[PDB]
Design a protein around this nucleic acid. Sequence first.
RNA 1: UACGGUGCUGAAGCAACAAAUGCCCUGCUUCCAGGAAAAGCCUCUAAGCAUCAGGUAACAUCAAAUCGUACCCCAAACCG
RNA 2: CGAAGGUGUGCUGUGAGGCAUGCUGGAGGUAUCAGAAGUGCGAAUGCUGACAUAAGUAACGAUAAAGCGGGUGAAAAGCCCGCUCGCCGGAAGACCAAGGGUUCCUGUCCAACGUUAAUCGGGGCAGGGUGAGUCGACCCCUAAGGCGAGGCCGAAAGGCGUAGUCGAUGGGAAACAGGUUAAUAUUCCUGUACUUGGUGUUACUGCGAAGGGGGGACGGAGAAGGCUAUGUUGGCCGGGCG
RNA 3: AGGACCGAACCGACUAAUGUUGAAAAAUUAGCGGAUGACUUGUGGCUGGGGGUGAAAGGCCAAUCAAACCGGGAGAUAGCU
RNA 4: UAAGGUGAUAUGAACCGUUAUAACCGGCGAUUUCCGAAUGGGGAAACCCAGUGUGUUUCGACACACUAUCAUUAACUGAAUCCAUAGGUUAAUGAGGCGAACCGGGGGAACUGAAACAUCUAAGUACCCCGAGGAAAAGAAAUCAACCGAGAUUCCCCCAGUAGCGGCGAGCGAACGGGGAGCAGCCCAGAGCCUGAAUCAGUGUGUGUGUUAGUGGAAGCGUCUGGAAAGGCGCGCGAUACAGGGUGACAGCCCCGUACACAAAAAUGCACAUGCUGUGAGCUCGAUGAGUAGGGCGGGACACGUGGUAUCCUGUCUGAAUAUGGGGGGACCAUCCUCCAAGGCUAAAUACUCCUGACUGACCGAUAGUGAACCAGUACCGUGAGGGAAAGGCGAAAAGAAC
Lengths: 37, 93, 102, 46, 77, 63
Amino acid sequence: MDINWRHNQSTFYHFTSDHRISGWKETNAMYVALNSQ
Amino acid sequence: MIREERLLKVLRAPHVSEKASTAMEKSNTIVLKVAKDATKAEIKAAVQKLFEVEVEVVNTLVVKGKVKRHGQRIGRRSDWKKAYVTLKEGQNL
Amino acid sequence: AAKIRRDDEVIVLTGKDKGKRGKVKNVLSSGKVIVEGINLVKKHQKPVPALNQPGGIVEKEAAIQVSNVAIFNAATGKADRVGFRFEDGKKVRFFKSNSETI
Amino acid sequence: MKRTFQPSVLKRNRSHGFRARMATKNGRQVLARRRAKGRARLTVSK
Amino acid sequence: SRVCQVTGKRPVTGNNRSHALNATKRRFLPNLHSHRFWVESEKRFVTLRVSAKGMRVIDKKGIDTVLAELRARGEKY
Amino acid sequence: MKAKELREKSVEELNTELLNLLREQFNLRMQAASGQLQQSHLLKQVRRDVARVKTLLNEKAGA
RNA sequence: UACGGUGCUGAAGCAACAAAUGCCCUGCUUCCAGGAAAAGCCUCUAAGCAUCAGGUAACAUCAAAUCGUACCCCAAACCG
RNA sequence: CGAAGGUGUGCUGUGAGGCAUGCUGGAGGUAUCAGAAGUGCGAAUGCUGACAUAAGUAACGAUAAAGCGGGUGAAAAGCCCGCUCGCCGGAAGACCAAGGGUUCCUGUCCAACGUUAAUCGGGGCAGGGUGAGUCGACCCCUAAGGCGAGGCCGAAAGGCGUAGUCGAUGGGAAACAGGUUAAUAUUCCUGUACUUGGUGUUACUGCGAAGGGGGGACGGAGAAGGCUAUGUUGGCCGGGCG
RNA sequence: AGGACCGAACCGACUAAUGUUGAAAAAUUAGCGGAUGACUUGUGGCUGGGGGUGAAAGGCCAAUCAAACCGGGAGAUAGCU
RNA sequence: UAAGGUGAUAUGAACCGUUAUAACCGGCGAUUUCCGAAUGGGGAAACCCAGUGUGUUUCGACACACUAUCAUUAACUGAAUCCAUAGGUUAAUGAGGCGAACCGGGGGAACUGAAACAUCUAAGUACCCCGAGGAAAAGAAAUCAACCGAGAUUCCCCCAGUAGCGGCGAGCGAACGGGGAGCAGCCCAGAGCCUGAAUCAGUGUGUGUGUUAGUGGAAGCGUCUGGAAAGGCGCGCGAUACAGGGUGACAGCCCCGUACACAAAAAUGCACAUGCUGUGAGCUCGAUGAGUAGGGCGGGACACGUGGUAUCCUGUCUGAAUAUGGGGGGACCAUCCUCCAAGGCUAAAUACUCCUGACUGACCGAUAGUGAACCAGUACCGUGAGGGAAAGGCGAAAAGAAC
């Protein structure tokens, strides 16, 4: 359980996805930034 | 011919179970654990010459070893080989 | 070699049995000895459903250290240290203090 | 969805197996580092 | 490889320098040509990959002495 | 038994070789694995005794 | 009948019609975009061997080793 | 006759601090005066472990659906048996390949695992279980492609490649019906078969290759014709007359 | 006959709604396009990082791509926090 | 060596042994499956398939041995072609692969610094590759010096952050000379005289010493607290032994040891001596390293960035003199001094620690010290290269809790 918890905390450490906050969290930040311009 | 020094090392134990038992008491076949590298000619010759009976035909399967564990330490057992030795009409053992 | 050995009579120097004599039952390669009637522990063991079931509190002897015993002189009647001399190509033990071969 | 690891034993061995690490200079250096690090299984064979 | 079989001339390395002195790596190559040398003592043509001053030293030392050197150092011709 | 095996001929260590394997070894594997054979030390001493016969047999034959 | 079953016995066992995307069919027709290889298989001989060896046919006899074989497999057993 | 440490109390110094002592602890501590520092933490979206918070809150993973009787049990909505009800039925049935690797079957246990309970389980423990001349692999042959004696090439490592040698997803010998195990079956048993090699005898006889020829040897589409699997109906046979 | 027509398997992904600490790190449901072809699919093989491949989007190259991943130079450098 | 043993978790069962053929320790042997350079062919490592020869009183099947490639040498064969070479076959010898650092050589970055950046730096570093040894390399003046002299190479301390080099920026940075460690010289290019003359190398033997098992090894009791004494108190003894560890609290005298004195059947390392084989001393005379030195062009190394740049190395084109000669002495010339290139060998001082032994620490003590005190390069993660944990302590003794 401890090994699975360390690896499953280590899941989104090297991500790329920009529309999702922290790799996973859905948001509207594309529209927020885009409307700020 | 097969040398007798080879031919003694092949048979290893008689196999006791209920499939073995019904094979003896129903179809003349004695089931026995053999050497892992033992061919059917060696098992046939070794039952011909070590229990002095007449063997009709041998059928050999190989049984895979079970991964057991002690405590939190695993281990596979060990593969062995099982020979279904079908005797002729005149036999005892 | 070994100073205290198997069929030998010793006296106990330290603890719970200080001054008690007794014969060495056996001698364990931990550097311990079991000496009869000396280090009595009160084990109590379960009556296993296999071969015979004693149950109860069995009073065994425990292993004491080899350094806690010394072999009994009986010519002086006290504890005595052991040396090793050669006699006729035999490495014999001997009592110190009167120099007697055992 | 079709994930990336679609296993095949024959491609596992032809690709990353022992006879294929030993087949060249740099795979032998791979085996040398795995032995030197001291590793229970060197290649992926079985 | 580009080695003269007589003089043993490998390609060496160096720099293209420029007017601004920018160092770049280059290779100097030997003038290797594959020439076919008549040997009178054996009555044959032995073809070698010589430099263009392996031919100078064959013209001076003679082809027999040179082949004795190649046979001496295990260079197979 | 180490000098005793050392003082026979090659043919006689082949005889007691085949009798260590034949009579002793096989009958004790069959007897051991069929619930019989209280005395298990026999397996060990037979096995080491075959090691002695093969040792002296290799030492006697040639080098 | 340890009601889980276990043995014994066991009649008729035909015809008509419909019918495949399976089989004849690696066929047939056609079309350009013109549709693997090598062995087994059958044959021809060269060097050689030639009243021998080998080939064919019949009969008899021996052999056919080794490894896989459980179980899931559109899934609670594989990849997620 | 009780050290370090821990936890209180009392006294004391301007402070960092010091001193004494009750209880826990159970074996080490160290004056003074010097010496050396991994020498003092509340912050670094600090690192590691522990524990809170929201909070006994959202959720408990297809809206295919359950109801009752009986059994086992310490306990039954969930397990087993029975009767009903619903769902899939070109699949949510059956058989494999790949992949996994004992999950299979039996007995036994309910700690943890199972998003609940569990007597149940793909969970724990033990025992059992996989039977081949004909199925598949190995094997013979090759495609793409790999490797490659020599060789050509390249600072070295190495690149390419001839002969060759490997490489199936392709070509090449042969078994079917019925029965059986809790668990295997074209493998075991019953019946009836077939294939390829070795050896021996007998009769006839020209045999002989990393060589020649044939064959293997192979497209898309379409169209019917002849069949069969299979199904439907009648006849027959057994049973029912509700 | 047909890069022919309608339409299942099969390949895809146009719209909407749900979902967005999901049942799911890209799906479900209801409709939707192709469906004998420039189709689709299984098994194997080949191409590799300033390189591949690209019916071209800077797309894809193991949930990573205006230059992959791993290890090293390496405690880069940081007039900044 | 031995009275106890059959390795651990890990108890049992069945036994072996006690004065020597239990067990344990050491020397030398024997066996040493399969994979792996893997070597008979192949292959998805630990598997599949052979050929050849020898033997097998049931030789209808078994057992054993050999069969890789390459280099060198030899034998027998052998094309186009006559001779012959290429090629082919067989045999003998050697190699191949792994390994932590040190060493030599072939290639060789960039981030960075210059407060930008390009010359420069980083840096001939990282890394890749080849090769070798217990060390390697270098080495016996065509070297300095300076009109006096020194005398091979290597390493250390100065010289000296000096002279210089330098977008004369950032930076780079000597030598001469001095003090030490260590010290060793030789051979071929070549004939005669003369022989085994020193020399080493390979081996036998003998001696000495060391390694691989070991042996002996001093000396204490009473009483109080206490669960227990090694502690307190009292009185003794050892010490060439009070290094250390254990023992129920802190032991010189309880145990193992320590100081000290001894021990090897066998295998070995080193050093002398000696036998044989190979090898050559010494004398006279002669020779005394040519596509080379030097040059032109391009590049590199020298502290030296082409600059007034000596010197060394060479990719390319050339090209001498050869002891009445030639190289150097920091452009260059003359005078003077010094040395003899174009062939080679050479110990010691020196560098390093995969590995073994002993000892030591104002090193750490379980978030520290190795990533790893514990079955850790494990679990686990990743296709892969690779990444990579957490986790010690009952008690003095299991007496580990009968009922």
